[PDB]
Each structure stands twice: as C-alpha cells, then as structure tokens.
Design a protein around this ligand. Structure first.
Ligand SMILES: [Cl-]
Ligand SMILES: [Cl-]
Ligand SMILES: [Cl-]
Ligand SMILES: [Cl-]
Ligand SMILES: [Cl-]
Ligand SMILES: [Cl-]
Ligand SMILES: [Cl-]
Ligand SMILES: [Cl-]
Ligand SMILES: [Cl-]
Ligand SMILES: [Cl-]
Ligand SMILES: [Cl-]
Ligand SMILES: [Cl-]
Ligand SMILES: [Cl-]
Ligand SMILES: [Cl-]
Ligand SMILES: [Cl-]
Ligand SMILES: [Cl-]
Ligand SMILES: [K+]
Ligand SMILES: [K+]
Ligand SMILES: [K+]
Ligand SMILES: [K+]
Ligand SMILES: [K+]
Ligand SMILES: [K+]
Ligand SMILES: [K+]
Ligand SMILES: [K+]
Ligand SMILES: [K+]
Ligand SMILES: [K+]
Ligand SMILES: [K+]
Ligand SMILES: [K+]
Ligand SMILES: [K+]
Ligand SMILES: [K+]
Ligand SMILES: [K+]
Ligand code: NA
Ligand code: NA
Ligand code: NA
Ligand code: NA
Ligand code: NA
Ligand SMILES: [Pb+2]
Ligand SMILES: [Pb+2]
Ligand SMILES: [Pb+2]
Ligand SMILES: [Pb+2]
Ligand SMILES: [Pb+2]
Ligand SMILES: [Pb+2]
Ligand SMILES: [Pb+2]
Ligand SMILES: [Pb+2]
Ligand SMILES: [Pb+2]
Ligand SMILES: [Pb+2]
Ligand SMILES: [Pb+2]
Ligand SMILES: [Pb+2]
Ligand SMILES: [Pb+2]
Ligand SMILES: [Pb+2]
Ligand SMILES: [Pb+2]
Ligand SMILES: [Pb+2]
Ligand SMILES: [Pb+2]
Ligand SMILES: [Pb+2]
Ligand SMILES: [Pb+2]
Ligand SMILES: [Pb+2]
Lengths: 356, 356, 356, 356, 356
C-alpha cells in the first residue's frame, strides 16, 4: 500500500524549543546518508512542550517548505491526539489542516502524519475521518496522506486484531495506515506497570502483537524509543530481539541512534562463528553498570521538586503509579496508618499525600 | 467504576472445615493492619470441600453478619460456578441469593462476589444476569454488587478481548465488573499443560493478557495463588514480575503472604544501588532447594491412594493429564503395548489403566 | 469431536521423490511401535517438489490403498493450499477429490487432510467447503474427513480467537477441525522476522496462542518442525517447553524423532531429585556446538548459486528477507549508496541488487 | 428440529380463574378432533390475573398430570417473562422448575414452554439458560424442552435477523427454539401505536418479518390473537393473508376459533371459479358492522372507572398511549393550556392529568 | 462498479430443449432493438430440464462463441447453485469453468454469471470464491466476471443487510456483485406461503428490501418473473409498483415482455391529466378475468398425474405445501381422522397420503 516496504528508523525532532525555536528541525532536515532516517518525524506531541505546540506547527510548515524537497527519507510529523480528550483530537486536526495548506509549500513534501495515544478501533476511525477531511479541504488526493499510529494503550493493542476487516469498510479510508509503532513509555503507564529502577519493562508480547498486527493488515511494525542513549550495546540487542519478532524498525532519538538502527538490520560485512583502573574518569563505565532503586522519600522529594518547577512529564507519571497506589491505600486503609508511619515516618507519609 | 482503584491482596478463607466449621472465617475477619487484605474472599468453591458448601454459605452469612462491619478491607465471597455445569451455576446463584437476604444482616457488609471458572463472554453474561436478579429480589441498588471473575480457561482469556464493547450493551449490567483474577491452577488443567515437577507454569502471556484486559476495560488485574508458602523469595519475585506487567495485586493464602503482598508494591523505605553445616535440622533449606520429578509408578501409587481416600483434588487433576494421555495412547496404539510394558513393566501398565 | 484426544507425533513424508518415487511413503507406512506416529502425514506440499506433486497425489492413493489398513496411527495427508493463491487452493481441492475416490481404496484408511498456509477465518471456510464438496461427491459421511490446519501466518494466528463462534454457524462444517499445528518456518517469513544465524525464532507467543486456541475450540495443538535432527537434547527441551504450554504434540521429521516425541510426554520410568580429546573425528560435537553468522557476500553467493541451481526454498526465502530489505533501502536511499558501497564494496552491492 | 413441521392453532387457556380455579384447563384438556389445537398453551401470563399466577402454576401441574397423556396435540404452557423485569424472569423460571418436577407427573406430557415479552437476542439467551438449568435440575434430556417466544417488541423483531448464527454458538442451547409467535396486542403498545377505534393495526411487516425469521432459522411462524371472536369472516381473511406470507398458524382464543383455524389452511373440499328487516333482534349484525371512536371524555371516564375497579389491562394500556401523550403535551406546553381547556373544557383536562 | 447503471430487462432463455436443442438460444441471440434485453440470461437452471444441463452448458459455449459478439446487451448466464446442496454448487462451478475456457471463444462475450438459490452471506462468499478461481484458472482479470444473485430465500433476504461491510473484507472479491434479483417463485416455497389460486403473493416487503439492499451496496435491483404472459396490463402495473420502490428492472420471459419492460420506465411520449357479445371466441377475455381455486381432489389428481409423468416442477412444489401440511396433520392428529375422512371422503385422504 505504501512506497517503503521496510522502515528502519523512525526519528523524532522537537518542533519548538523555548534563539530559533525551529533549530532542531532545520538541522534534522539536513541529515543525509546513514545519519538520516527512513522516516523523520517532526514531533509536535511529547517532544515539544505544550505551551510551544502552536509555534511548533508553524515551524513545521516553515522548515519543510524551506528544506523538505531535499530530505532523503519520508517525512511524517506527529500531531497531538488522545482517545480520551476531544480537545486534543480537535487540536491535532487543526494543526494538520494548517500544515497541509497547499499555499504554504510544506504538504507536497509530507508523506503522512503520526497519531499517538489512539484507543479502540472506533478512535482510529475518528483520526482517519480527519485525514479525509484535510485531504478534501485542500484538494489532495484521497488517501495520499499516510496515517501511522502509536500503540500506547491496552485498547490499541487489542484494536490491531480487528483491523483487516475494519479497514475494508466503505465508511472509512483506513487503507491509508502505514506504520504501527510501539510506545512503550506511555503504554507502561496505561497498563499501570512499574519497575524498581523505573526502567521500562521489555513488553515482549506487545511487540509480538504489533508485529503480528502489521503482517495481518499490510502495515509496518516499528518499536518505541530506547532512551538510554549511551547504551549502544543494549540498543543493538533490542533491535536484534525485535528482528526476531519481525519488527525491523525502531524509534531513534539521536543521529547516532539513527546510524546504529540504519545499520543493524543489514547483513554483516564479514562472517562469524559462534560457540557454546584501565582509563581514569572514564570509570563512568560504572554509571553504565549501575542503576538506582529509589525510596519513597526520594520519589516524593523528586515529585515535590518537579511540581514546583512546574525527570520529564513521563518520569513524573511513572512515579505517580506507586504514589497513587500508596494514596489509595492510605485513603482506604485507616487500619494501616500506624504501620505506614512507622514504615516511612510521618514526615514522609503526609508529604506523599500532598504530592499528585 | 469501583471504590478501590488498586487492590494489593486478595485473600481466600475456607468457609466450612469439617469443632466450629466457621473458625477460619472468624479469625480472618479479625485481621487488621498489614495482615488484613484489601480484598477478603470467603471461599465457598475450591477452598471448601463440596459436601461442606451448603454449611459454608450459612457460615458466610453468620460471620459477616457478626464481624463484617469492622472488617477494614472489602469483602467479596467466592461462589461456585462453572461454564460447563448448569447445576453448578444454579447452586452459586442459590447461595448468592441466601447470602444477600437483607434480613440476615450480611449483605450490607458485602461488596460483591467472585465467580470462578467462567468461559466465553456469553457465560459472563449468565453470571451477570444472576447478579441482577439477586439485586432485584432483595431491593439492593442495581449494580451495587461487584462481580469479579477468575480467568482459568482459554475461553475466558479470549473473552477479555471483547469486553469493552460487550459491557456497554443494554441487555446486561456488566459494568459491575471489578477484578479480573488469574487462576493458574485450573487454567493449567484447562490448557492441558504439564511440568516434570508439577510446579505450575509461569504463564507470562496469560498475565500480560489479563493486565491488558483490565486496562482496556476499567477493571483491576490480580494474579493467582502462589501455593509454596515457604518460598517467600519466589513470592516476591513473582510480585515484581507482575508489577512489571501492570498486575499489581496478587492472591494470598496466609496472613504472612498478605503482609508480604501488602508491602511489595509500596516504594522501599531506603534507596539501593545495583551493579553488573551453618545451623542443624534447619537444613530444610534443602527441602526448599530441591524438587522431585515423579515416575509413572509414583503417580499411579499416588492416584490409587487418593482415589481410595476418596495431594488435593487439583493435584489429582494435574496428574490426570499425563495419565489420560498414557491411557489414550494405550487404547489406540496396540502396536505399542510391548514397548510400553517393557518401559514400565506390566504391573504398572494395567494399574495405570485402572486409575481415572 | 475426534477419536484421538491426544496426538504426540505428527510425522511428514515426501510423496514423490525424483527409482520408485513413492519409496519414502511405502517405508513410512511400515513403521510400527514407538517409531510409528500418532498421525502420519503424507506430504504433498512443502516436502515434495512442485513439479512432482501430481505424481505425489497418485502415490498417496497407491500406497494407502496397498498399506493403509495396517497402519497403526491415523493418516492425514497434507495438500497444497494458500490464502493468497486461488490456483493453489483449486489444486489442493482437485487432489483431495482424486485421493478420496472410493473406487481406489485409499479413502477408507484416510482420517482427514492437513491444509497449510491458511489465512483469516474466511479462508478456513473455503477449505471447509471443499471438504464438504469432496464428501458429497464421493458419498462419504458429512464431517467424516477431519481438517487440520497449519498456522503459518499472522492472519491465521488471529483467526484462532474467533473460532468457537464461527464453528457453530450453519453455513459451514468446521466442527471437522482436529489439529491446529504451528508452522514456524513459514510463519517466520510471513512475519518478516530474521535471526543472525538463520535459526528459527522460538515464537513462544505463537505457541501459547495455538495452545489456547485449541483448548477454546475443542482442537488439539501441535508444534512445528524441529529440523536440526542431530540436536536431540534441543528437541527434548522444546517438547518440555511446549508441554508447559499445553502443546503436547510435535512435528517429527525422522523415525528417531518419532520415537523421541512418542516418549517425551509419558511419565519417566524412575523418579529424580533436582537441586539448585575424548574421542577422535567425533569432535563433530563442535559442529553441534557452533553456528555461523553469514555476511552479505555469503548470502548473495548462496542465493546466486541456489537461483542457478533453480539451502532449500525456505532457506532461500529466509535470506530474501534481509536482501529485500537491503534492496528497498538501495532503491529509496540514493543518499546512502556511498556508505553502502564502502560497507560491502560495489562488487557485492550490484550483485545484491541482481539477486531476487 | 421439532416433531410438528406445521402448527395450525395455538390455543391459550387461563390457568386460575378466581369454584374450581382450574376449570378452564380441565375442559381444554378434553378437547378432541377439529376442536383441539395443534398446540395448547395453558397460559400463566396475560390470560391469568397476576394475584392468581402461583395457583395457576399448581393447576398446570394438577391438570396435565391428570389429563395430559390423552391430549392429542402438544402442550406448551406460557410462563411469565419480561425483558425489562428481572423479578418477572425469575418468577417464570421458578414456575418452570416446579412444573417440571418429574415426581409430579406433568413434565412427561409437556413439550416445552412459551416465553413472552422477549427482547434482543441476549434476553433470549437468558431464557434459554433457564431452560437448560431446569432440564439439568430434573434429569431431563438437554434440549428436550422446546422454547417458543412471543414477538411483542421492536427489539424482538430485530432479534430474529441474527438468530441463525447466534443459535449455533456453543454457549447456548437455542436450537430448542420452536415457534415464533406474533403478539400484536403488546407489540402495539411497545411501538406506541394507536388507532381511532382501538382496533389493532394489522402490522403486515411484522408478520412478514416473523415468517422470514422462521424460515431462516428453522422455526415455525404463528400469528397473534384475533380477539373479535364473533368476526368469523375477518378471522378467515386474516388467516388467508397470513398464509400468503407463509405464516400458517394462528392463535385461537375459543374452541370455535380452533375449528376455524384447523380448517382454514387445508385445501377446500370442492373447487370454485372467481371472476372480476330480515330477522329481528338479530340486527346485532349492526354491532358487527359498527365501531366507535371514543372522545377524550370517554377515555378518561373509562380509565377512572378501570383504575377504581383496580376493558382489560391491555385496553387500559392502549388508552394510556394518547393520554400519556396528552399529559406530555400539558406538562411541556404551558402556552397551549388555553386552547386545550377550550378544546375539552377544564373539567376534562385536569381529570386527564389525574389519570395514569 | 459496473458498466450498466440501470438494467430494465433481464430475459431468460432455455439452454437445451429436448431438433436443435440450442434453438431457443440462437434466436434470443438475434434479438435487437426494443425486443432485445439489457441483460440476457442463458438459463442453465430452472428454464432447462436437469437431464439436459450438461448439453446446456455446451450450447452456451457454442452460441455465444458464434453469435455473442453482435449481441447488443450484456450476457450473464445463470448456472445451477443451491445453499443446501454441495453437489449443485460444484456442478455450477464446473459449468462455469468450461464456459469460460478462453480457447472456446465464449468468455470474451460474457459479462458475468447469475447464481440462484443463494443463502446467508457465507454462502455468497462460496460462490464468489468459485468466481475468483475460474478467473485465475483462465487468466481473466480478477473481478471481471460480475456476479448476480437471485434472492429466493429468507436467508438471502436477511443477507442483503450486512453486504456493504462484508463486501469490503479482503478475503473475498464480492465487489463483483452486480444485480440483486428477486425470485418470487422459489421464495414463496422457501417461505412456505400459499394462496387459494396458486398465484404468487406480491411480496412487497421483499421487493422493498431488495431495492434497499441494492442502493446500500452499489448493486442494481431487479424483480422476478411475471409468468402470466397474456396479462400485459398486470405486468405494467407491477413494473409501475416496482418503480415506486426503486426497483427499475424486471425479469422478462418473452420478447414481447422485453419490449414492454424496455418501454415502461421511459417517460411517456405525451402528457396526461388524471382525476378523482363484442367479438366471438375472443371471449377468452373471460379466461383473463377468471381464476380457479382447486380442491384437495384436484390437487391430488394433479400431483398423481405429474408424478406419473415424472404444471411444471415449481407448480408441483407449490402444491406440496398444503399437501405436506395435510400429511403432517394426518400423521400427528389420529383424533382428527374421522372429521378428515368425512371432509374429503377416504378415497382422497389415503391418496393424499400417497402423494409426495
Ligand atoms: Cl473522549
Ligand atoms: Cl478508546
Ligand atoms: Cl512489519
Ligand atoms: Cl453448560
Ligand atoms: Cl464457555
Ligand atoms: Cl490493573
Ligand atoms: Cl486470493
Ligand atoms: Cl487471508
Ligand atoms: Cl493475544
Ligand atoms: Cl491441546
Ligand atoms: Cl432488566
Ligand atoms: Cl432487550
Ligand atoms: Cl413457518
Ligand atoms: Cl450445504
Ligand atoms: Cl444458508
Ligand atoms: Cl437499483
Ligand atoms: K476502507
Ligand atoms: K472510503
Ligand atoms: K511483522
Ligand atoms: K451494560
Ligand atoms: K443494563
Ligand atoms: K493493568
Ligand atoms: K458449523
Ligand atoms: K453445516
Ligand atoms: K492446549
Ligand atoms: K447452540
Ligand atoms: K450448548
Ligand atoms: K415507535
Ligand atoms: K415462513
Ligand atoms: K472484498
Ligand atoms: K479480495
Ligand atoms: Na528517498
Ligand atoms: Na476500608
Ligand atoms: Na490405531
Ligand atoms: Na398427537
Ligand atoms: Na450494448
Ligand atoms: Pb479510555
Ligand atoms: Pb504519547
Ligand atoms: Pb500476512
Ligand atoms: Pb527528603
Ligand atoms: Pb467449555
Ligand atoms: Pb477453580
Ligand atoms: Pb486504558
Ligand atoms: Pb508402587
Ligand atoms: Pb494475505
Ligand atoms: Pb507451508
Ligand atoms: Pb476449555
Ligand atoms: Pb563471494
Ligand atoms: Pb427494553
Ligand atoms: Pb404479553
Ligand atoms: Pb430457508
Ligand atoms: Pb364524563
Ligand atoms: Pb438452508
Ligand atoms: Pb430457483
Ligand atoms: Pb445509497
Ligand atoms: Pb379425482
């Protein structure tokens, strides 16, 4: 259905940083060769602060208009969307309409849009309908804008199961679907999962399911952000694990990740047989080798700080899980207040209840 | 939809032990603090012998009437049910009707009921309809009794996929759904699985799927019984694995498990950094460290014993898998009788065929 | 629904080898005891060269007519089929019709047929309808031919979810379904997966899902080919892993595998407790212990060879994945041609583009 | 699926009249020959006053036990049921359970039960489940009690469309379905229809749809009560119209209707060619020829009377339609009170508002 | 989807009359102008005796090869098919395959095929799959053969409701659907309807429903055979009634009907205002004005005759309805044998029971 049968790299850039707010886009747009992504995603949702998103959409039109023709990969900006926020949906749609105004010269270099936070199949149809309306409002060919989604809810994971048959209904244009991209960060929160370090679970079933959804429906599966940018070995191992599920693309957050991800699924240059101090302040190998499990006090410290500063929003949300749980317990189990105060001291308890 | 946004512990108690048959309930009802469950489940199904289940339902009304007001958690007794037994369904429904007679004073302290052995979504609706009828027979608010299910069949696992949309149909009241609880013990038998030791498979996909079903439908996911009560470390590791799937509650079988499970998902009191004889008859550390793989002779010994005594019923059923398989082979492969007798000796063979 | 409640072994034989083309069948038909499969599958699809498949179907009728009565297991030949090839479907159906001509004496010893490469549930119905027509064309009892399928697509994996309810519709006879068999080889290609060595991924979710589909629908789950015939230990470990998912049967490719698979799910003869040079050119233990990761040059060498000879077809297809990917990249990323030539040298590049 | 391929007559009898309350049943049970129905329906729902329905169910067991063996047609008593009343459902189920106690000797002469007021297909399943439970509670063969439904809601009319496929699901026993019977009286009220005289609309589409539902699903279609017992010509014309839709059975309310309905679909005794005072107080031919359109005053008179006496309940409900409408208008259109009082006088208005 | 946006006339011809069996086809093929149909249907099903249908399919290839190029309308032969006969389905498919052999020169003048007696939507898919296989077996363009169906069952009428969404599924090619044609003759029997004269009911709902199905799915609605060929006025009135439902085409059985039907939906040549012996043996105006209602004796006479001669088969089937009903009554109501013998005399009764 789409020109790229495989996509190796899916690279996001912030659209407006709060200087030239568009600086990140103009540089990403100059990337070439192995450093340039099969798919580049100017990112008007999680990569860009919310107060900056209207300037972000302006910057997307400015840059793609100016540099879009020369970009060697395909361009699919990510808009705002949420299955549970009609205001967010309408926002994304308004931005899409602006960005594709043919008089501004960007649309002709835009292959499609990425829609995050989608829900059940009826939510996907609402995004599709916006695509169709944008196309008709600006005289584009029907179906010419590809839609890609980020799978970051239980709901969306289940929705991939019924796609082949829903896609063929005549009341939608969902043949425009292109990529199915996992969003482990938000999926973790939607699932209310938690780990001692805050590292993301690996969610091998999700990735299996997205790979399968993609092959059943004629889409392309892509894995989510691997945000420990220094862990080049870990990134490679994830990509290899993914390739064994038939998920041959991955999200990249830097141009070095892009190079690594562009190279990983290609056959090696030479064969190999497998069988059954030292520097100085380069002992930051130990930062690589360590991880920290925070206490209640730490998490509450951190949150209090982040709330006053209002750790990015996703870190804050991840912490909110165990804290929301602590607070549900405290509200509903008066019989446990004594063991809890004794467990954490009352300083912390009452502070944990103020957080959120 | 329900008051408890999180549930950490789901603790079952037998309802009639064959002295005061209700003794286990009266003590469980006195538990407080960290030893008391978020959800307490007086258990009229697998925890209670079948000849005792009618006295069990009487005991549930006596105890909850007498001690129910003071119980710090929520009370959700488990009734009998089976997707393939209309008599069992009707039994559970009769017990539910008795237990909730408002003149007996228990119902006002009962938040809902737990229904085991459910099947496809149409079986869930049959349980729901019984709830609705009980509510109307006794003037309770419609939807005031929460329903929780145990997922212990392939059928039920698949049914979670279609819940969001089935729940909204006007011919049911399935918005009453609260917990989705895995039942690994019976699920193992429904799946006809088997292990060399008889240890339960870990069934990570089931737990993933139940976690996902819960987040898609507004329910709460809970894992099943960890019956090796001495293996406190194993219990903790399972809980941690679960938390990484977004399954933050677990079944508890003793008040010590309850303490462990009540504490596990709470943040630690202090931080930690991670990196890449001796006693005497306390060498029962070796019982902890060992496991035994039985032979055909052992299993048939055991079964013959258990059948004469008629190892609990679930152990017997687990054994029945390889034995049923041995017997299917023997009935259908006369060409294999010689290698089989030679394999086990004829003593055993003919005994294996009498078992069942 | 079917006579065999359990099936341990599913053993395929080529139907026409290009001497007596039927030689493999006549020998397989003589197997007895532990060396003989619960289910024997004369294989007219992947085990038999395509130019030989019409003689294959003749050989199936000759041998089963001659030796079929004495065969101790059940006989279910595999026909050609493909969800995306109407010509292949019609071929399989024509062969089935010939094979079951009651005047040729084979049908009375044939329990059913195996259908590979099935897709969504509507494709399964197309196979079912062919069964029904064959039955009526030859006066067989309706439903007397069992249908077994090979699950080797994402589509088919998803289709198992809706089977219980689709099976009961009156417009089909899908109660004839017997085995659900995983086909990891082709499933790997349908999923576009790849591994460094070319070893098959383990696909634990697929096997979980097929086991679950089987228990939900009254079918029997069977795992796919373990083609490293020398790795007897690996075969045993896979069977044990499978048994823990409730997949108690497995495909066997030699009579020794048949013995191993016939023995594996039976209880051991004696108990066991578990706890927490040397020869000469027998150093082929090292062939067992090694594996090779090929380079681009190797893969392209190999393919060029195989294409000229036109490594079996499935190996060729597995290689086609990374090469198809390399070629999609080359066609769409002119900006990457320099780093690619430098990576592999231009000899290889232009050769990689000729392959396919 | 059922013994009677055609059913001509469906004759209801009250079960307890408030003397021998069972008198009507004992006589109906003696009917023979053309005066006896293909299907006799001891009627514990609309034919029997609600305060009498528990004695009604007792009378059904007494009479059928005593006279049931000799009855020449099939016996299918009608139980209470309502799609919107869980208490009514449970009542019907309790009565069914009592009536079929095999120790009372009625069940062996009962072919099935008639369930009125059914809704969407999920409500039909709730009735089916009660049947299945009754069968298992009393050791009857599964599926031996036929279920017949009365179609008297929009919901039920739509439900016939999806029956063939819902009937085959393994979670129900709806193959027990036998008759689909129109209930024009209640259907009229469910549809909120009204006529100037109070005569029932003819509802030709309903009858078409029920006929079609019956042929699509292997059931038998039957039309509803023709309560103008003296209008023998009208009854014949309705039966002829019905026969032209493939609805070959009809409800009968007297033994004379039974004779007429038993005779109508049989071929005439001789052929016929078609082409393009007088007595005295026998001028009650004029009662036959007239009908009366009541005024608001009449209807309110009547209702006030009926409410004080608390015209049967169905007449009262039919009147409630225009009156409910008048009252919705009065509550919501204060701007219309003057034209309304002038239209009816205020005597009536304020009385019309007290009615209901 | 298809070239003809409207179809006025759908004219059937027998394919082999038992002289030149193909005589009827060769003449129909010469029709031109107003006497020639928009759609001509060489009819290998009900118009042709069953013993003649294999020569019929040969004749279709001979004539269309010889005269097909010059035919001014579109050619869509009707094949045999039945929802409940796998042998009939396979027959139709075999004939379709022969007829479209491109080496015989007919296919290039064949626009599609007409499939009668279709059932639920899954039966329509079975016909579609045969089309797809025929296309691929002979190198035709996929979808180039239009499929038209005859709606002559309750099942098929209900199936039109779900067509838009089923048509878009990727496992079928049902976008090939062209005409939806009512078959009142067989639909009458499927519905088990009956009239005093044997005239067909008008079935206005069916026609409404088929018209609606056609507009919902992008198909064209056509009414069924009006077999009283002399009643030119009646034919016109039916066509006008149809046009008011949006069913603008009708079946034609003679070239005069073709002229009438070709002219009816065209605007009149001049305007008109509407407002609120005589010959000799031309008194066959009375045959036009009369109709005969047969007795039991007549019908049984007739059937006995027709059975010995074995009134066409459809007349015989129509009679079978009341007779099947009489026989169900006689088998099940021994209490009615006396009134029945008295009603018809025993001569007739026992004869009525031998018929069938
Ligand atoms: Cl919303
Ligand atoms: Cl959603
Ligand atoms: Cl993919
Ligand atoms: Cl059941
Ligand atoms: Cl079930
Ligand atoms: Cl949860
Ligand atoms: Cl295809
Ligand atoms: Cl498919
Ligand atoms: Cl899944
Ligand atoms: Cl299985
Ligand atoms: Cl209700
Ligand atoms: Cl309803
Ligand atoms: Cl009928
Ligand atoms: Cl059939
Ligand atoms: Cl059908
Ligand atoms: Cl039309
Ligand atoms: K579409
Ligand atoms: K569309
Ligand atoms: K994939
Ligand atoms: K609901
Ligand atoms: K409800
Ligand atoms: K969860
Ligand atoms: K079926
Ligand atoms: K069938
Ligand atoms: K299984
Ligand atoms: K059923
Ligand atoms: K059933
Ligand atoms: K209405
Ligand atoms: K009918
Ligand atoms: K299609
Ligand atoms: K298609
Ligand atoms: Na490019
Ligand atoms: Na509490
Ligand atoms: Na055997
Ligand atoms: Na009888
Ligand atoms: Na033409
Ligand atoms: Pb939501
Ligand atoms: Pb997001
Ligand atoms: Pb695929
Ligand atoms: Pb602090
Ligand atoms: Pb079951
Ligand atoms: Pb259980
Ligand atoms: Pb969610
Ligand atoms: Pb022993
Ligand atoms: Pb496909
Ligand atoms: Pb294959
Ligand atoms: Pb099961
Ligand atoms: Pb080379
Ligand atoms: Pb309602
Ligand atoms: Pb009613
Ligand atoms: Pb039918
Ligand atoms: Pb008055
Ligand atoms: Pb049928
Ligand atoms: Pb026909
Ligand atoms: Pb339309
Ligand atoms: Pb005669």
């Amino acid at each position: 259905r789409h020109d790229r049968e495989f996509v190796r790299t899916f690279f996001t850039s912030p659209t407006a940083v709060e200087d030239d707010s568009a600086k990140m886009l103009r540089r990403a747009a100059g990337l070439r060769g192995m450093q340039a992504p099969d798919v580049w995603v100017p990112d008007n949702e999680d990569a860009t602060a919310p107060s900056m998103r209207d300037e972000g959409a302006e910057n997307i039109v400015e840059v793609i208009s100016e540099q879009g023709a020369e970009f060697p990969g395909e361009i699919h900006p990510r808009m705002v969307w949420h299955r549970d926020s009609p205001e967010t949906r309408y926002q994304g749609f308004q931005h899409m309409l602006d960005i594709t105004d043919p008089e501004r010269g960007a649309v002709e270099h835009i292959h499609g849009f990425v829609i995050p936070e989608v829900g059940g199949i009826d939510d996907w149809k609402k995004a599709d309908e916006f695509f169709t309306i944008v196309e008709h409002e600006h005289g584009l060919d029907e179906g010419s804008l590809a839609m890609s989604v980020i799978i970051e809810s239980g709901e969306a994971e289940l929705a991939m199961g019924d796609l082949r048959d829903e896609m063929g209904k005549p009341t939608n244009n969902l043949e425009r679907l292109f990529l199915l991209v996992d969003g482990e960060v938000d999926y973790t929160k939607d699932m209310r999962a938690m780990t001692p370090t805050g590292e993301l679970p690996a969610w091998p079933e999700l990735r299996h399911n997205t790979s399968r959804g993609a092959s059943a429906a004629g889409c392309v599966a892509v894995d989510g952000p691997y945000d420990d940018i220094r862990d080049v070995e870990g990134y490679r191992e994830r990509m290899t694990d993914n390739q064994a599920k038939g998920m041959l693309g991955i999200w990249s957050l830097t141009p070095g990740q892009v190079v690594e991800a562009n190279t990983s699924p290609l056959p090696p240059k030479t064969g190999s047989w497998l069988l059954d101090l030292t520097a100085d302040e380069l002992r930051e190998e130990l930062l690589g080798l360590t991880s920290y499990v925070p206490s209640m006090d730490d998490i509450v410290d951190s949150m209090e700080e982040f709330e006053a500063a209002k750790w990015d929003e996703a870190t804050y949300q991840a912490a909110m899980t165990p804290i929301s749980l602590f607070q549900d317990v405290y509200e509903n189990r008066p019989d446990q207040h004594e063991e809890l105060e004794e467990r954490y001291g009352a300083g912390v308890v009452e502070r944990a209840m103020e957080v959120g």
